[PDB]
Each structure stands twice: as structure tokens, then as C-alpha cells.
Design a protein around this ligand. Structure first.
Ligand code: HEM
Lengths: 491, 491, 493, 491
């Protein structure tokens, strides 16, 4: 056994006693020793005041989540595409942490609420930590970075009531066409995954990979579930929201405690700069996919999730990912949404966790060290602050090693831009309508789902939603209208 | 009509554009102007970095809640008991704010979860802000202050899984007998109110009120709903949690907008020092009630809630109550739980909100000013910091006016105490069993509710639970074991 | 009379009393009522716990400073150069706040320390707050943004000792040539001004100003003290440093309380894009000035400082400036140092003061309001959070106005390039000229030598040697004169 | 790997410490054409290093902001187990690792080491029974004996709320209105207010504490640490010149002495006093303005300590170290000294703000020699210690056996508000102090010289009050200060 102590190592005799000077007991039928509590009762203050400070801000988005440790293995040679050390040589293994999450829901909300799902993985490489911060859909609601807070605002609560507002929700989406593609995924049954074990991961954005000769290619990354894609119907997700809000969390934890380790197979699509020039859409458009016919998937690795964390708060809660955490061989593209993400994530980490959040164990570059003599001091500096090491570069008395050193071309002035709609923007949602209804029940599900949601909205706004979905296939607005009034008929 | 600006007031022409230098477009079939985002895009960084910082910590407890403004009225003369200015003269109106809450649930959790409910009221008087930080039960789970974090921890999530753990839950309560009284409430249908409009508020603790002669008396405050006490059945509460996790929030906001303003009538129980000496229990025991036959309720006022906040975060989320915020005429008793609360609430405020949280509007002493020249500086000092006023008392150049009988008596040494069980502790739980089953279904409900929750616990711990309830009435344990078996049979 | 209360408005009878239960007095020749302090003593805990939290971090740089309110007046029509609202019409007056500062010293350090001086002024205009964050020199130590923390670190304290380290100090400067120009200023007597009233302000950087047709010109801004430029000698500065560390602060506060209000006349230098293409140096180089011969100053305004703050902490300490706080008519240039500043200052403010620091009175846009429905919540939200105004643009139930929206601008060609400014022979030319400019005044040149010599005599020999080489890059005699005087200083031990 | 590789905070290798990414302006037409353009959001190296620079600073301590530290060894040299059961005092020859911080009081971070102030003398002992802080001053007494006066006192010692200048009016207005300061002020104005170095001053517990022997018999104590380097002071003039020449003089003195191996050391003594002996005294053991006379209570030698090791990083160790008088071990308790009593609360409270909620996880602050085990205290910001993984967060958890280490004054009356009231004896000891100086030539004139220079900047009316005040100790003093006040006014 060990000895129960205060935060400073002073042993404690009883966990439950507090100091008091008792009232005089003369006259009392019942006289337990009661009196005012004392400032000197250190055990009391020291435990209370720590209790008082247990909480940190939840993430602005993706607040609700579960995570696990595991292993990534390189299974094919792709060194002709990508020079990254963790991909160096076949059969090489890298430790990973993956956090799954919903989007809008706050910390106590339901695992089975309707949302995209977050799929973020930290790779502890010899070249630093690489964060693959992916969603469970290959596309997204926006392609203008600054629209994010607007969008996310209308996904959450009314500033006054603190209730979800169907009016906001649809006012935003219908006013911004480009959201159509992702909204259709959201209201399809894909919006309601059974478990994290049964969903895919997609980079969404295009990134840029470099081989060791300095030749680069556009890439899109797919992680595909060896457990297969299974989804829930609205009724079922709804019931589970009430019976078990932590369903997915529980699912993933138990799977792992049993030995039923879920795993994913990892592919990429690649494309050259010349190839990109001939497309009807931009590689920088987060609302688009690369058709599988024209750009096939190339296998490169897999990963398996096999180890639960030891304490949830310390690891799952405090872990911090950013797309700007990358390694040599992988750069980000000019996808403007991704570009802004490069700044946000570290910025928000500094607020949610604190200036030195990389010093928290899960966030440490465990496989490679770090040596950054220029970043010093700041709150809660626990890593030794490099002792006496000089804090500027080329110090006479500290020799440091630096690593060995066509691309895209730019023309024009500095220009303000908001992505402008063209005809092709409706084409990909059109095809997705066709992709559903290659399965019985899928099209009818979308309609029934969009309809239950939209029926609480005011009429003038329901109308705009019909118009909106009809931009994909005219039948959809009609079918949704037809279902909305069936629901109103009942009561 | 307003003009859309930066945080610094500079006007903005388009809310959606961001600055880039575009890629050369020779050869592209589709050529939108895309390029890397720039540091100089102030509108971009300004709105993102703020977005990155929207969240503050949720309250360690009572995180999930709803609030409203109202009016309190003095309806009878109680100046013989209490000298407080806001009870001065009959007919006197005081503006209030009330926040209702559940206890253990985090911010996205369900309104209709089984819990006590918080009932906290801020009174803006001529003598300062008075916080009556009440529960919807006249008792509580604990009477030793330092047990609170232990208790609350077992009420929440497992350190490793982040799941609720029925093992913890019952392992704590059964190990700590004194919880039995409150747990019987919690598992009665009273653990599940229909709305906040249909519940009572109770001071729980005993306070001390003083009249203008300096004569004091122990008090217990009752707030009784003019809307009557209505509860939900477990089946319903579980459904509501799934269909509408914001049921109680919506209920309150809608009532008020409709003009169905809820109200409560206010009563006190009073008791002299002499009287207290003759009781089989302590006035300082939070697990005890004052029987109504022995100490009758005296009406003194009513309050009505009639005004929704304008911004939920700014008012309802940022408001800070503390039992140590009192006025002349009301002091705290030696109730050691209450004692410890006097420290915690301001302590936690300084962490949740910030050192100067009393400068946030809802938290201001609106009716009376403040003038506290010793309290200066600190982060986010927004109230002017008293300009040039000297910052010590009896400064030569700053003249200040200050405000213009037998009390309790103490003897002995400083003594460490943990409240020790006596036979009477089980007596009041016994009576509550008799109080239930004066209504058909109440008793069977308690058993049903305790059995459903406990069936997921391991056998050895189910066993302790039976023991535990039987300490109130022997049939109860046996009835729970009966239903536990029945439920296990089906599965 | 006002009534002494707690933070919560409860009246307090005695400022000095604390609650206790007394020890039994029996047997005591002296028995004052003493006992353990109580948790329920709210007056105690409330005032102590606030006292516990009085401090916030100091600025990473320019920590030590003094501020005042004033008035800016447009005195000439420059609407042909700049469309900014506060420069609209002749005679227009704008409320300002200026904060003067030293660079490297911490909060307790001396006002008469050798350092550049900061000169930051916040203008409350009808189109938002404009910060003109200037120094007292038209140039600076660096022209590569990311070098700043390196440079600053070496100006400050050794990671182990917490002492200044003359080895670091010179190690950095000497390894980075471009600092020579500004280092010469620093060690001439201009690194030691007499007061803040007797120094000039310069934009340092090149900015871009736009008239209402959309025609833009590169600018450099000059604030010239009507009280003239007066400097101290080393020995005087050092003595004052021991006698009155707050010399400059006192001086400014007293001048204004007398009515001896200090003032500055404002000029600009302008230059067209076409003119810039012909120069031997870059408009984007913070280590260069624009010769007065070729680009003459144009007078446009004046400001006077005439009002002390009411509470120093609340106003001088908490005020936050940022070069990215600008108004229509004025944009930053591609000066990479300036560029990085655009990000830094608001970033640091969020740390030093907090997420919602603009809500602090001095930092508010007082003359124009603000309406930014996208920015909500965050810690210490005190401005009402816009009540129930929808928090997204083009909300169906919230009608909004935007400001009314061209000519040839700068043009860009190439790939994304990593660049660290590379030395050319012209970099030494302007330091060479500054040696000639000193020595048109007796004693100026010999001062720089003495000042560099006394500082560098605590450095190890091997590093002293690099310093002579360094100054000798401007004019050879300077190393030799410094080596000579360092050796004659060593002579005594 | 040696030489170390230069990386970002996340471990990614960097090629050049000084480069930043841009897209260059077109160079056609330029006589000089370096590649200049707008900086980019994607430049991680830039944002990463700037944003951390932006956050280097934390609040300085409210008082004692200017300091220097070193590590050393304390040795038990005598048997005092009849007085104190403290483990680190257990057996003769036992060595304990300590860290000591020396500081001035009111000065801020950039201020002079040789300013006139008391000097702090704080030492952390890492014992097997937890961390012990002996938070001492270089004088055996202090300015106040009423706790809540501290902020008033400290405010007037510092800067004017409007000017930010020191205000001699304030300074003395406070001191003269509060008589009990006279004793300490004499110390302060004697040459002892200006030590030559930290090596050449003593440390004194100031307060009375209570030590327990293993039988549980206690005794009041006072601790003295006496410099083996002797007590050497400076003259005001010297103190003022050094202030300009070398504001870091004491820091440099300490560092250099240690680096040379001229380790400074202190011998440790205690005075003891029984409860009964305390009853017969003309003053209280609880009065910090009082010393125990050496004739009646002789010093008993018990140990020594030596400071032999400079810190590796100043910020990480010296700056972030946190001491509190409430950090104690078994065998040592605090007394009822009300100033000490309030200090028990203050120091932890301030720590949580200066450093943060989990400051005890910072290395220098860890109980290094004893572990800790406090399963109740979890989560909270920058939680870096592993948060005890899966260990239950409540006591007497069915699934986690814990061990609890196994183990006077009397009180009578009501709760009473007290401000200590002046009696005739208060002036007596300052009177003795005047006699103690002037046993050495130049000491009495000095005090006079020093008080005069400081006071000659105050307004006349307040100078008068200062004369009266010193005269309360000995009438000549007032008149001698008035005398040298003019000798100065006439030079
Ligand atoms: C009511 C009276 C006092 C109060 C409320 C008080 C409070 C404080 C506070 C808030 C700090 C800053 C600590 C930190 O920021 O980590 C501090 C530091 C300090 N105090 Fe006091 N103090 C009082 C009197 C005293 C006395 C009587 C002594 C001498 C016995 C003393 C010695 C020190 C020392 C040496 C430090 C700095 C320790 C370090 O370097 O961390 N103080 N005190």
C-alpha cells in the first residue's frame, strides 16, 4: 500500500475530519462538537480549493469525444510519393492516439446525436508529432474559412434562449448553397453512425506530399473501417440518446477491453499539378470529392486501436491536435479552409489548455525529442526550461544542428475573395442523390430526416429549404414538402 | 440600422472575404483566385481568434441550468425577527435573478435527468447583493463538508472510462449512512420534477436572522410553488431526456414569454437557542428537517419571475452566487457544510469567471453601489478602479463614513470531528417512508427507480444497497431485491 | 460621504477587525482576545483574496512606461494623400492617448536606462481606433521578423543567472550586421533622452496611405517635439537611475499638472511606387531612413498632451496598442517586421490582459461604436454581449449595413519562398553617414566611443575583438577608437 | 543526439532559424530587388515562435517580487526530539535538501537589490513527511499584528494609484497612524534595513510556532538562523550608489560566491516556552511586533544549513518556486498569531493565481523526497503528472485499499471582532532597541540620518507626525530627526 497525503506530501490521518472549536454543550439533549470552520484547516482548504478548479473550457467544437492508443504500420512502399520518416520502410510501426467526437454537441450531450464525426490521430514520429485531423466525410459545409464561426453558431444555441433554433440552422445553410453536398450526407443515414468503430476517416482537404527528390503531388487520404460502414436510423439514434448518451464511448472502450481491436486500412489518391488544371472543380474546394473512376486509391498502411488511456481527463480531454503539426514530406495545400485551420488549432489550444500545453504528456513529442531554445518560460513551465541553454540562435557557446534544406506559381495583386457559385457546384450533390437509392430506404430516409427537423421551423423558412434541396434534384424539395405536411396532418 | 465593424470599430465591407495572392491561372479549365492566406488579414485573425476563445469552464456542479429576472415583495411584517433593509416595510419590491439547475450533469446533459435541483436567487438590495443559494429539497446527502468532492466524484464519471459508474455511486452512499434521507428523496419521484415552475426551494441549512435590537433566532426558509408540486415518472423523464434535453429550459422561457409567470410564496420556521437545546437532532445537521407540527411556517413574502435575460451567456451563464454574500440581519449558522460553502463559492468564481467577476453586470451590486478602496487592480479591471482614491483606510485626504445581546458560547480545545452516527439518524428516513405511500404508487416507484439504477451494479454491491435502505424500513431492501431479481429475469 | 463596503456592496463597520474565538484568559498577566481565524470572516477573505490577485503579467517588452491623454488636430489638407476620416477636414480634433516607454527594462527598472523609447498613440476616430505604435528612432535593430525574440532575449537576462550578460548582448549584434545603424543611435547620446517631452516619434516602417480615388503612396511619419530634442550624457543617466528611477514618469506627470503641456508637430514623407523602383535600398527595410534631400517632409497636423489619467493601472497599464488597429485610408506595407507585428500585439494582449481586453474602457472604440455580432462570449464578457442579436451575418431577422466598397496596386510573381535578408555593401553606407552626422557636433562622436567602451569592457576579450570589427564596418577609426579607450579604461586597476 | 537537432515545439526539424515565408513582389524595374512580400499564415515556425514569445511573462509576486535562489543542504546537528517529532529532525547527522529564496519586499522585478527594505528568507525542505516551507524574514518582528492591515501597509509602501510614483506622504501617513509599526520601522531605518548581501543577514521565524514531541507534548518556539558570515550592513549612500551602478548586486553576489565554492551557511537555533511561562509575560507570544528577550529564553542549537548549488534555469526554478507557511510536516503546527493565521490562507491562494491551479506539479514545487498520494485532488488546468491514471477519486473505495498514518490550549467566549489595542508596553521594546543601537558608534546617528533623508520629501504636517512617532520610543529621536531634517534643508 501507499500513504494518503496532501498535495505537498504531508501524511493525512483521517480523510473526513475538519477542525472546529465546539459550542458549550451544557443544556443540550444532543451535543455533537459543532462550531465554526478554521482557516488553519489546511486539509480542508487544500482539497476544496482544488475541487473548485477541476474544470477547463471544453473545446469550442467537437467537445464530446472518446479516444484510444494504438499502432500504425506501413505496408507498402510509397516513398516515390512521400519522404516522411514514419513511412520510410515497409513494416515500420508508429504509436498513435485517436480521438473520436461529434461536432456541435456540448460535453454532456448524446454520442448518437446527428452530426459529422471527428477522427483525429496523433502520430508520434522520429520527425515530430503529425496530426491527421480528419472527419468521417470527404467533404464539408464550407469552403470559405471565415464562414466557420457563422456556420457553427447556427448549429448550436440561440444567444438569448440557449435552445437549438431550427430557424437559424436552416437560414444559414439555405443562404449558403455550397453546404448542400455535406447537408445531404448529414441527413442521410450517414449522419448517424452506429459506433466510431464503423465509420471511415477522410482528410477532406487536399494536402501536398513530397518525395525525397522534391517531386510533389496533391493527395487525399482515406481511412477505411475493417469493421464496415454501419449506420443508425433516426428513431434508433434518438432512443439511444435517451437510454445511453455515452453509447459510442462505451462501445469503443469495451471493444478494446475485450480484445476486439477495431482497425482501418489507409489509402491515398494522388494527382499531379498538370492533371489538376483540367478539372471542372478545384482541388482546393472542400465541398468536392475526387471521383474514384479517375483517381483510384493506393494502399499504403493500416492502423489498429488496442489500448485504452489510463486516465480520461489527463489524456483524452487534454490532448491537442492541429493540422499545422506536420512532418517533413507533408505540406498543407492552398485550400483556404485548411489554411485558416493552421492558425486556429494552436490558437485555441493556448486558451483551452494554456501557453505550454505541449508540455502535457499526451502532447509531447515522445518519439523524437524537441530542442527549441527560443521558446522559453511562460505559465506552468514544467519541462525544465532547458536549464542554462542560451536562448538565441548562433550563440557563441551553444552549437546546434539544423536539418538539410518546380512548385506552385503566383501572379496578381492582393485580392479579397469569397468563393462564387458556378453551375458545377450543384452537380456533385446531384450524383449523391443517385448514389443513395442504389440502396433501398436511403433516399426515403433523407427525406424523412430533413422533414422531422424542418417541421419545427416557421413556414417561410421551410419554403427556402424545399427550394434548397431542389437545387440538387427537384423531386427532393417536393418530397420533403409532401412529408412535412403529412407530419402536420397528424394534429 | 447598424454598421458591421471589427472589435476595434473599423467598418467592414464584406463579412465573408479573405485576402490572398492568387495562383497563376494559365492552363486551368476552372480558375478561381486561390492562394495562401495572409497574416495581415485582420478581419480573419480577429474573428477566428475570438471564436477560438468563446468557452469558459462550466461550474464544477450545477453546470446545466436556466435563469430569469423577477421581483420579490415583502407581504408581512417580520422586522421583529430580521433587520434587513429589503424586508424593511410592507410592500417593498426588490429585483432578483434566479438560476435553476440540475447537479451532476454537464452542460449538454438532460434537464429531466434524476438529480436534486438547484434554486439560486440573487437579491439586489440597498445593503448589497444577497444570494439565497437553495436546493429543491430541505435536506442533503452530507453533513461533513470535506466529503463533498468524494460524494460529487462518485456522482459523476469514472476517471478512466468517463462513463457513469453505478458501483462508485452506491459504494459511496452505502458507506455513508447519513445520505439515506436525501437518497430516498432522490429516488422518490421527487428526484424528477416536471419543470422548474413546479418545485419548491428550501434553505436546507439553518441560518441566523437578527432584529434591530440584536435579538436573533435560528431560521429555515421555504419557497413554495404557486404552480404546485408536480413530478414526472422515471419512464417519462427518460423519454424526455431523449426527445428534449432542454425541456425545463424551454418550459421556463416559454412560460415567461407567454405571460404565465411562475411565483413562489415565502415562509420561515423560527426557533430560539433555548428551544434548540431540547431537540433529539442538531439545527446544524443538513440531513435533518424541522417537523412542521413543532415549528410552524410563517409567511413573509412572495416572488414572481417575469423577465427573460437578454443574452443567455452574459447573464445566466456568468452569474455567480455565494451563501457568503449576505446582508445586515442575516448571518450563516455553524452548519459545517454551509460554513465550508462560504469559502468555496467565491473561490471557484475566481477560477470560473476571473478575479474581478463582480464587475460583470449581473454580478454588480446594482441597487447599492460599492466603495471598497482596498480592493484594486487585478485582470480585466473594467469599473474604473476608483480613479485616484487612496487605497488604504484613514488616509489623510480621503474621509470615509462607516456603518453605525447574548450570542452563542464556545468552550474546549480545537477538535477534529467527523459526524458520528446515532440511532436517531435512521428515524427521519423511516418517517419519509410513511410519508410516501400516503400516496398510491409513490413507494412502488421508489423501489422501481432504485432497482433499475442498481441492476447494473455488481452483486456484492447490490447486496450493500439492500442493507442500506433496510436501515430505514426492513421491507424496502427486500422489495428492491424482489424487483432486482424480476428485472434480471427478463433479458 | 460614501459608505465603505465589501466587493458585494455590504456595509462594513470597521476596516481593521477580524473574527476570532478567544483563548481562556485565566492566569494571563496580559490577555488580549486571540484565537484562530475563521472561514466565515468574509471581510478578511474577500480583501485578502483580491490582494492576492492584484498583479497581471508585464509587457514582454516596453514594460516600463508613462501615459497621458491629449488632442490631435489636422492643420493642413492632405486629403489628396489620405482619405482617413479623422483627417477629413482642417481643424478637426480627435481624442488621443499616448504611452511612452523604454524597451528592455522590467517594471521596476530606471526611466533613464539606455534604450530606444516607445511612443505609442491611440486615436479614437469615427472609423475605429487607430494605433500608431512608434519608436523614438526612425530605424531599428532588425529587418527579419523572427529575429525579434532572439534579439530581445540577448537584451535581457541570462537564463541561468538572471543577470544582464554583455557577452550575449554583443554576440548577437555583432553576428547580425544590419543592427549596426540602430546600435549607433543607441550608443550615441540619443539612447539617453532627458524626458519623454524632448524626443521625436517615427513610424520607422513604411505604411501605405490611400486617398478617396484609390491612389496610394508610401509614407513615413514624423512627430517632432516642439520642446526640441534634448539628451543626457551617460554619467547623468546613470546617477538619475539611482536617485530617481521614475524620473521621466514624474517629469511628464508634473509638466501636465502645471499646464506646461508638451506637443508634437506631425509630418509625412511620401514616395510613389515608381520612385521606389529606383532606390539603392528597400522601402521595406526597417534599418534604413529616407534622405530628407530627396523626400521632403509635408506638415499635416499636431497633437498636444494635456490630461493625466485618473487611475494609472486601469488606464496606463491596461492600454493595448497594435499596428493592425487601423482605419480606412491607412494600410500596412510589406515591411516584414511590421507584417509580423500585425499578428503579435493582439496575440500578446489576449495573454497579458485577456480574451476580451477590448472591453476595458481605454481600449474601447469610444468615438465610433462597434457592432461585431460574430464575436461573442469569452471570459469576462462585460459589455452586454449584444443581448439577443443573432451571431451570424445575414440572419433573416437582423438587418445590417456594411461600408461601401480600384487602381493599380503592388504585383506579385513567383513561388512561395523562404527568405532571410542577405547583406549587400549598401547596408554599411547609412551607418557611415551617421558617423559624419555626429561630429558635426563636438563631443557626439567621442560620446558614442565612450559609451560603447564602458558597456563592452565587461565583455570577455574574444568578444570585445568582434565588437571593434563591427563598428569598424561603418568607419574603420571607430573600432580603433573603441579598442583604444577600452584599453585605457582597463588601465585603471 | 549531440549536437542537438533544432525543432519546433512539436519536434519537427527546422532548417533555418531566421527565414520566413513570403511570395515576392515582381522585380521588374527595381535597382534593388530582394524577395519581399506579405507574410503567410501557414508559416508555422513564425507563428509558433512569436506566439510563445508573446506569452513568456507571468505575474510577479504581489510582494517580494525581486529575489535570488540557491539549493543547499540542511544538517541536524543536535538531538531535539524531546521538543519536535519531525522526521527530518529524527536522528543526528540527517541531511535534507533545501532551496532558499532571498528577496526584498515592496520593489518590483526591475528594482534595486540594495533598496531599503526588510529581506525575505524563504526555505523549502524536502522531507520524507512532505515539503516544509520556513517562510522567514531577516528581522524577528514586523510592521503589523493585525492581518487585514497587510494590504493597507503594502499599498503605502508602493506606488500612488494615480501617479505610479512612490509617495513619502502615504508611506509615513500609514506608519504614524499605526503605532505598533514603530519597532520594525526602527529596524528598517537603522542600517540593518540595508544589508551588504544575503550572505550577511540572519533569518527569524518572526511568528511563534508550536512544535510537538512524539509523546504529544508541545511548546511555543521561535527559530533563528544566524549567518556564519556575520551580520554586515551598508550605509545609505553606498546603498544608493550601488542602486545605480549594479541593481543586481545581491543576486550577483550570491551566484558568484556559490560558483567559487565560498558557500554561505547559517546555524539554526530555537527558543522554547511553555504554556505556563507564557501566562506570566507582559506581552503576547502572538504579537509579531515583539521579541522574546535572550536573557529569559536562551537559544538552543539544533542544526545548520549551507547553500551550495545554483539553479540550472532561473525562471523555472527561482521564479516559479512557491512557499507557504501552511506547508508543514507532523511535529510542527502554526500558532494563533493572527498575522501567521491569515498567511496560511494567503500564500496558496496567491499561488493559484501567480502560477496556476496545479502549481505543485512544477518540479521545484514537488514533494521530491516523499511522493504524494491525494486521489481526491484531480484534473484542473495543465495537469501533467498523469492524474493518477485509473485510481478512484474518493476515499474508502471498495476497489482501492488506502493507508492513513496514525497520530492543549483552551477557548472560552463568543465570536468576537478584534483590532489589537495599544497598551503602555508597546512602546517599551522600541525603547530597548534605541539603547541597543548606540552600543555601537554611528548606529543611532545613522537611523536619524536615514529617517531624515527619506522624510524630507514629505509635506511639513506629516514630518511633524513623524517626529512625534519616533519620540514615542525616546523623546530625543523626534528632536534629532527634526534637527538633521533642517541640516539637510540648509546645505
Ligand atoms: C498578513 C501578513 C502577510 C500576508 C497577508 C502575506 C502574503 C504574502 C503573499 C501574497 C506573498 C507572495 C507569494 C507568492 O506570490 O508566491 C508573500 C510573500 C512572502 N512573504 Fe508574506 N505576507 C504577510 C506577512 C509576512 C511576514 C510576517 C513574513 C515574515 C515572517 C513574510 C515573508 C514573506 C516572504 C519571504 C515572501 C516571498 C517568498 C518567496 O520568495 O516566494 N510575509 N506573502
Amino acid at each position: 500500500p501507499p500513504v494518503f497525503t496532501t498535495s505537498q506530501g504531508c501524511p493525512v490521518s483521517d480523510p473526513f475530519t475538519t477542525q472546529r472549536i465546539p459550542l458549550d454543550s451544557t443544556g443540550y439533549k444532543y451535543a455533537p462538537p459543532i462550531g465554526p470552520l478554521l482557516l488553519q484547516d489546511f486539509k480542508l482548504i487544500d482539497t476544496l480549493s482544488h475541487f473548485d478548479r477541476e474544470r477547463i473550457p471544453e473545446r469550442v467544437v467537437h467537445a464530446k469525444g472518446a479516444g484510444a492508443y494504438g499502432v500504425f504500420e506501413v505496408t507498402d512502399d510509397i516513398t516515390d510519393v512521400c519522404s516522411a520518416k514514419f513511412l520510410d520502410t515497409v513494416g515500420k510501426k508508429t504509436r498513435i492516439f485517436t480521438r473520436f467526437s461529434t461536432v456541435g454537441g456540448e460535453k454532456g450531450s448524446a454520442d448518437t446525436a446527428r452530426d459529422p464525426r471527428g477522427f483525429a490521430t496523433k502520430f508520434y514520429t522520429e520527425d515530430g508529432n503529425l496530426d491527421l485531423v480528419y472527419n468521417n466525410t470527404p467533404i464539408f459545409f464550407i469552403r470559405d474559412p471565415i464562414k466557420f464561426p457563422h456556420f457553427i453558431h447556427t448549429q448550436k444555441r440561440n444567444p438569448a434562449t440557449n435552445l437549438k433554433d431550427p430557424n437559424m440552422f436552416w437560414d444559414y445553410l439555405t443562404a449558403n448553397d455550397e453546404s448542400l453536398h455535406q447537408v445531404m450526407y448529414l441527413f442521410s443515414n450517414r449522419g448517424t453512425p452506429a459506433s466510431y468503430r464503423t465509420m471511415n476517416g477522410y482528410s477532406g482537404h487536399t494536402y501536398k506530399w513530397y518525395n525525397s527528390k522534391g517531386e510533389w503531388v496533391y493527395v487525399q487520404v482515406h481511412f477505411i473501417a475493417n469493421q464496415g460502414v454501419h449506420n443508425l436510423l433516426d428513431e434508433e439514434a434518438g432512443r439511444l440518446a435517451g437510454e445511453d448518451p455515452d453509447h459510442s464511448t462505451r462501445d469503443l472502450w469495451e471493444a478494446i477491453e475485450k480484445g476486439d481491436y477495431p482497425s482501418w486500412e489507409c489509402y491515398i489518391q494522388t494527382m499531379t499539378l498538370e492533371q489538376s488544371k483540367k478539372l471542372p472543380f478545384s482541388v482546393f474546394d472542400l465541398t468536392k470529392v475526387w471521383p474514384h473512376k479517375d483517381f483510384p486509391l493506393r494502399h499504403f498502411g493500416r492502423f489498429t486501436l488496442n489500448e485504452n488511456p489510463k486516465n480520461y481527463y489527463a489524456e483524452t480531454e487534454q490532448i491537442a491536435f492541429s493540422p499545422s503539426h506536420t512532418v517533413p514530406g507533408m505540406e498543407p495545400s492552398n485550400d483556404p479552409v485548411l489554411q485558416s485551420r493552421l492558425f486556429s488549432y494552436p490558437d485555441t489550444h493556448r486558451h483551452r489548455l494554456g501557453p505550454n500545453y505541449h508540455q502535457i504528456p499526451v502532447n509531447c513529442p515522445l518519439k523524437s525529442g524537441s530542442f527549441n531554445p527560443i521558446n522559453r518560460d511562460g505559465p506552468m513551465c514544467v519541462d525544465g526550461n532547458l536549464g542554462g541553454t542560451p536562448n538565441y540562435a548562433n550563440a557563441y557557446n551553444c552549437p546546434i544542428q539544423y536539418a538539410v534544406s518546380p512548385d506552385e506559381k503566383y501572379t496578381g495583386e492582393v485580392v479579397p475573395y469569397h468563393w462564387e457559385h458556378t453551375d458545377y457546384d450543384y452537380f456533385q450533390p446531384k450524383m449523391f442523390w443517385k448514389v443513395l437509392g442504389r440502396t433501398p430506404g436511403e433516399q426515403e430516409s433523407l427525406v424523412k430526416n430533413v422533414a422531422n427537423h424542418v417541421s419545427a421551423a416557421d413556414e417561410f423558412i421551410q419554403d427556402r429549404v424545399y427550394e434548397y434541396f431542389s437545387k440538387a434534384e427537384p423531386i427532393i424539395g417536393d418530397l420533403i414538402r409532401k412529408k412535412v405536411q403529412e407530419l402536420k396532418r397528424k394534429a
